[PDB]
Nucleic acid binder design. Sequence first.
DNA 1: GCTACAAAAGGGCA
DNA 2: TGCCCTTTTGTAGC
Length: 183
Amino acid sequence: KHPSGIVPTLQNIVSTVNLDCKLDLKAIALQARNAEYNPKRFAAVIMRIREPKTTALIFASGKMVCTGAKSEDFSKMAARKYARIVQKLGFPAKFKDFKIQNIVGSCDVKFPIRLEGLAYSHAAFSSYEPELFPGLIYRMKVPKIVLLIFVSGKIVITGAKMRDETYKAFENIYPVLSEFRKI
DNA sequence: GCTACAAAAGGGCA
DNA sequence: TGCCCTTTTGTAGC
């Protein structure tokens, strides 16, 4: 499962669910204290809960985005809790088509990387402009995943909709990272 | 408290 | 149109 002997830690999960009902945002924004709303700035009511620590963007259309959870299950859990809060408020809220939209992971290979060398050998995948951003942007094709590689050996993997995509991207990159270990 | 990246949802505006 | 808007999170040099 994990040949490199390293398991990326899941850091942020983004999901969406359909409450399947139109919502009155100003009413929700008035009844709730755990809520914010400035339509002039953004179309959603921003709401937050402590456990699991997350932030939901709630729309009039009944759709909802959930951010900040550390796992897929935590994300679904937080979404149901927001859905329960909306119900207590007077809306016939359901929970339709809950879907994990993005998973962000990170790990430490515990060795320095020669980013310049890596980018040169993988030009068709690499974006390295150190004066702009200190990390090398690696757009992997299979799985379709974006990895941010730093000189420190710190790696961020984002864009996954399944956690096995996150693990594979990392196992795919590990041998390349070793090839460009900074001695 | 910006550079960079992924992703969703919506109003607004070239 | 599509591209911002907003939110989250890791990373790191400015």
